[model samples]
Target: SPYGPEARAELSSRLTTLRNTLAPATNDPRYLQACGGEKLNRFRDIQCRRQTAVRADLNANYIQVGNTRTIACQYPLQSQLESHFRMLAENRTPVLAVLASSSEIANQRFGMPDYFRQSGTYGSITVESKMTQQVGLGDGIMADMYTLTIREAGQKTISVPVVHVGNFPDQTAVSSEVTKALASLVDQTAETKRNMYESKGSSAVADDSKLRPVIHCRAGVGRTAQLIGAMCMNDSRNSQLSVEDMVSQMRVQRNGIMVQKDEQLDVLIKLAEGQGRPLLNS
Candidate 1:
């Protein structure tokens, strides 16, 4: 059955309201070109959000990667903030996989299933699981996997999983086994994500356009970048591509600082050298 006249009127009314909300201001040229030209509200600025804005110029936090254009954003520390989610939808990405070092709900703020439920109109999300488990080398790493059942209007529900590798020490060297496990998981996840795109009947145009993945850690620059780098290395079709080349390609989409430390760089190099996969199976 089709929508009735009442539904039409409701949609038209909503469109008008949205137009009023999004319409550019006559007094501001910048507002005409871009949104968020209004002055900052003091109440909305939390400690981390304020710090992020302060450090944005110096911090290489936001980035897009690979042909599918996976996005990496710093953790959404301020739950009240909407820009991160707004920008996320604006980019038209389907999945948001968060990798963090903390398990506290406060630390993992935002991107929860309920947040998406009340934030948007047509989309619906159900959280299948958000529990922590042991997953890496020696089953020593504690990770949280959040499975979301998503449905958009007439489309069938799709299950999107967000895996969080928590309790990972910051700025410390990860063992070879740890690196291998991470790379393997990243590679496998990338494949599954690509398959999802194909199953949606977008395979013909998958090269030209595909939904992106949004990934983040606390800072969104270090461990996040490492996983992104590993994904790039695993997916590189060019035999001549070096670790530097893959990382450089990622940097082109992100800020020009994809790899923050030597150890992270080493993991990327090892993955690119065809070394990590063997240990992953062993």
Candidate 2:
């Protein structure tokens, strides 16, 4: 079950090719993926062959909440997840829970499973988020490419207002909408920092200085990675992180991290680059 070096070389070369094709705009949030076709010739941009999901700990403080960062189409390991939530509530620690749209209530069994929703509302912690849109089983499957950014360090802000960009096609927007609301209520923690900066005559916005920015989608890898990657790009220190590279890393962490081939990656990258270009090339 192990791959030989030659085979590995071929695989690596192929991945590079794929990643190459997904050049230019590699991490724009507004990118959309068209499904139900011939897979849109997107084999090159993805970072791996198998879909893998592992706990992604970005910058030590950003812990993977809910299910570990993943690329699977299935749900999280319920028992372990529930236990984690219980611990969070008991400790009264604040954490961001990024669940894919599919993981939300209506998609769950028994009319709104309380696991996720309850954790935010009932538990002591607060949740913030962003969403990834996709063509589902019905209506020809049109999906949106969205990214949410959370800044949590080197600034005075504790937690900035949960800014959400939810648009059209009702179903997908639900989760994003809820996260936005929660972020607003619990966002006060960052207000003092903002005021302090203003008092100092600094027009710059303060960062979200609390915990890992919870970013999720159907699978935690694709949409999640894009947002986090974009957030990295926005900051001067992390600007070198390429959107395509981030997409590749996400794919490495979880197979099929991007369900929409290279479309979303390309679009997002373009936006990050601040220019015009086709995101994917065959």
Candidate 3:
């Protein structure tokens, strides 16, 4: 077909020159509906809305990619603080996958609260992150993993693991090095989380939603959608899903413009077809 590698490469070259990384959806109905018209609220610094009428609490949604379920939220502002604690506490899945660098957070442009802090009190829930492990994945600081301890209306000893990937600037794609390192860390964190959760004989309803990790970025659409799309396509069970198919699934569940950038979607397409799949040495 004309829309194969030749066509894709043509777009990729042009995509790099554009200012906004959003795919070619200037007035696309799906994009319009997904964003829901940006209104910067105290709860969400990123001006996007959850396209669901059922729950209007946060600009967030629960998305299940194959067997992996996740809470996709914009990075919480200081005003929207306590809700994050409650969500993590209630989900009982404390694994948070964050896509942004430390410095970008300090950038006044986004105006987001740095969520990977060591300790904080969220209403009745007091949370603390112990041991920031930046030593993994060949030690040049590809990512940082934190073990969070929360005393909530709290029960069930859960180790909150946060996978913080750096150099992924907002509304942009990172180097393959960044994506590659993150690809493995997310899987490892989720895998370890599964083993941790399942080691308990409490309950096993096939593969439950407890296995889902929470993901967020600046807007909770572009990078967030990319990761979710990647997660959906990586596993072989969802082999029926194409890159477009996985994105369609995500847009329905969360925000309409989940995978915002054509570049990000390109990464997902590569992953779906095993073109850019990383080979881990360890």
Candidate 4:
């Protein structure tokens, strides 16, 4: 392992220090700025003890990994589902990984309802499913794949690939096999979108970087963070970037806890060190 015992120790050290890193004393103002002020933070999601807020009501955050940006937000409020699809069109995001279940989204306060299948027009935007499949994304991980055509009032229709993974529940641990499959599915779908835009030639969008993948759950921190962390390690197994650095980098953008549970952190470490597979093959 290029990332040997010392690297592993440092990774664990980084994981354990998150509370201190996010402490009010040591918090970075740059990240604080990212979360916006109280005026804008009104849109933030409800926390503990049945709390809620106002305005745009968007609990969203953005992070970048080697120029590929991903949005991690709480499941859209039912009222904002239209704006959510509009946001997806504007960013030209290739894939949306939904970790929340139907019942959870339907009954979890103001969480989004089952719009992926409904294909109904939500105010200014319309989402109509073009195709559906239960394809195996490798390792026996079958996801609900939706080829969706999303359009905002006057803009061109945007085709978004959405993968709904049922087994990946909130704050739970999953195997390295699941991580590897999800990682590859994300990369492949994203690359395929890039190529489709490539064939557009002269009239295409200015840059492929605009087409980031969007992933989310109810709160957007737990499952979203773990999967994104796995993807980062998947792309950087040869490099020496610790999983700790990855988590902290995301926290900077998110401006709160990213990977919540220790078990989730362990899965990230497993993927980071390239476990569950033979390194000699590489």
Candidate 5:
């Protein structure tokens, strides 16, 4: 037993030494630049994109856009609603929306003349809105995740898990209630996935030719970008992508995302590594 234990320890020491040498060095100029060095416009970013709050990537393989400049007009600011309707109406760019304050009768009751529920999905932009209950964060999560995966899967049936979170502070009226609602929505979304996976007798949501889905909160940015970043990193064959590399792609394609809150970006990376943690634990 003593001889065997000593042999195993020696083998482990050798393996550690081998890894230290075999691992590629990181001092190369490209590596330095990639990890933390500065590179202006290295990722095709333009400042104007942020000001307009509109980003459209017409790349042949991917089309992911994010716009936050448009107002949701949650208090029924009908004029603001009209402005948003006018903007979406003009853009022919295959847009998919998730509003937060609209109800089941949204097309008629909660929107402007140009509000076309048939064209794009719309729910309350915020969990604070009472209308959100009819089709709250849960609905947006499913819709957006489905939307993201379908884009890659080529119009096929694919399943995705929707995630919800409390993104606002409790400084305003009704914020606490909204926070509780958001937390409940997150648990419910996970539960929904659990029921489906068990019912189907599968380990996780299946994706043969179709894409995997992961949706989030408003503007399809902020929380949305964080989870999607995790998915993107997982998709890459190499698991060595840095946060900046991933964030740059998002900014160039979606504009200044992943920077909303530093903590959110950190959480995204952690989630990528543990994407299946929830299912396994549950």
Candidate 6:
């Protein structure tokens, strides 16, 4: 099965050349950087303090407007609760607005208060009070608002106003009356926060001081991106940007696949033309 001497020589020469080509790359810092070696090493020492502390996925990300920001992520499972707490603690900025329902469809729900309570138990986060209200979005479409007070040891408690829109992925449309209601409520909350910071004798709040609102849907890509894009578009004054531009910018922040579906893009365009126009006009 072995090659003759001449053939063997040729094969050995090719093998040596291949090894030489790869050897230099093995030690190249640029190669490592391009391959995510540095990023992976940063998390190499991360040990899960609790069995459920490790994140199942890193779909979480932030997008900023002036000083304000919003964090988007996939549904945080029971196990990933600690990771959520870790993010909250590191960010310091409070408030979490969940866009998914807690109805447990497909064996999972974004269970806001329940998730916070669990974090309180295992992640050193304490939920002081939780109040719920039913909000109607016309045409019989309704959702629940969960206002939460949460604190960690040695830290001041913060308000986390959660609005569960209950709109499933791919169901986002400007034609839907609920879409307008949900967008308006979320916009109002962000505006109120901005005003609160500005009233404190500051022209513009710093990134660290402004509360980052946590937003999420099931996978945190489609519906999540749509809502965030609309908010950002609405916040932009005299914006020349289109819905495509808004979604494109978010993709750069989260992932290239961020506004995943075509219909989601449609939702953004619809809002940009109708409800989202008022802000730009003003």
Which tens-of-lDDT digit does each residue in 1-282 have in candidate 6?
122345334433443343344332333431222222222211222111111211223336666543235776666555555556656545543446666554533343323335642235556776554656667767655656665566677865555666666544335443434566766777776567556656765433565423666777666666677777766755646356544345544544544445666566556555655643321110
TM for every model, in the order presented, reads: 0.58, 0.40, 0.74, 0.77, 0.31, 0.65
* Minimal lDDT window, size 10, model 5: 67-76
Model 3 spans with C-alpha error above 4 angstroms: 2-56, 135-141, 154-157, 204-209, 275-282
lDDT of 5 by residue, 145-180 (tens): 221111112222332332312223212122222323
Q: Candidates' lDDT values, in order? A: 0.47, 0.34, 0.60, 0.64, 0.31, 0.52
Error of model 4, residue 101, in angstroms: 2.6
- Model 2: per-residue Cα lDDT over 102-163, one tens digit each: 33435555232333432232223343334433322223322332222222234232222222
**What is the C-alpha lDDT profile of model 3 across 109-176, one tens digit per residue?**
77777656568876777788776776343425456778777676645545678887764565457544
lDDT of 5 at 249: 47
What candidate 5 gets wrong by more than 4 Å, as runs, is 1-217, 236-238, 272-282
Ranking by TM-score: 4, 3, 6, 1, 2, 5
Candidate 6, superposed: residue stretches over 4 Å from native: 1-58, 65-68, 89-95, 105-113, 116-120, 167-176, 193-204, 236-238, 275-282
Q: Evaluated with TM-score, which candidate comes out highest? A: 4
Clashing pairs in 4: none
| Clashing residue pairs for model 6 | 120-125
Best by lDDT: 4
* Model 3 lDDT at residue 174: 57
Model 1, range 1-282, lDDT digits (tens) per residue?
113345334433543353344333343331211124442221121111221131221212334343325666556533323444444433334556566555333443444233322334322322233442345543476445555444344544445545666567654756545656765665565467657667877542344233556676655656777777665555555434444445554444443334556577656555654642221110
RMSD of 5: 15.7
Considering lDDT, which of the candidate structures 1 and 2 is the better prediction for this target? 1
User: What's model 1's TM-score?
Assistant: 0.58
Candidate 4 lDDT tens digits, 196-280: 8768762435754367678877777777888887776566442555565677767666644677676777677677566432211
